Structure 1
Amino acid sequence: XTWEXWDXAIAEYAXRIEXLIXAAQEQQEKNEXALXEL
């Protein structure tokens, strides 16, 4: 169980950040849409 709880939480923030880097790659692939339309 609480310490091994936290080391859970941090790995499941690291979910959220690999989330952000989803979002950024799926901007990159809109940007490369834009550069299509140009």
Structure 2
Amino acid sequence: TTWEAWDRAIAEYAARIEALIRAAQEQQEKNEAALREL
């Protein structure tokens, strides 16, 4: 429940979101590719 505990949780979820966004990006590429090969 401290500020440092806040800094840590923020940094944790920032990293997570970023990795999710990258996965969505590289998977948007793949779906689009496949969809224009269909």
By the TM > 0.5 criterion, same fold? yes
For 1:35 and 1:6, the matched residues in 2 are separated by: 44
Describe the superposition over 1:1-38 as per-residue Cα deviations: whole angstroms up to 9, x where unpaired: 213411321212111000100111101112204423xx
Structure 2 residue runs without a partner (length 5+): none
* TM-score, normalization by structure 2: 0.64
Structure 1 consecutive aligned stretches of length 4 or more whose deviation exceeds 3 Å: none
Same amino acid, percent of matched pairs = 6
The count of residues paired between Structure 1 and Structure 2 equals: 36
TM-align CA RMSD: 1.5
1:29 partner amino acid? N
Which runs of 5 or more residues in structure 1 are unaligned?
none
Give the alignment of 1:17-36 within 5 angstroms: 17-36=19-38
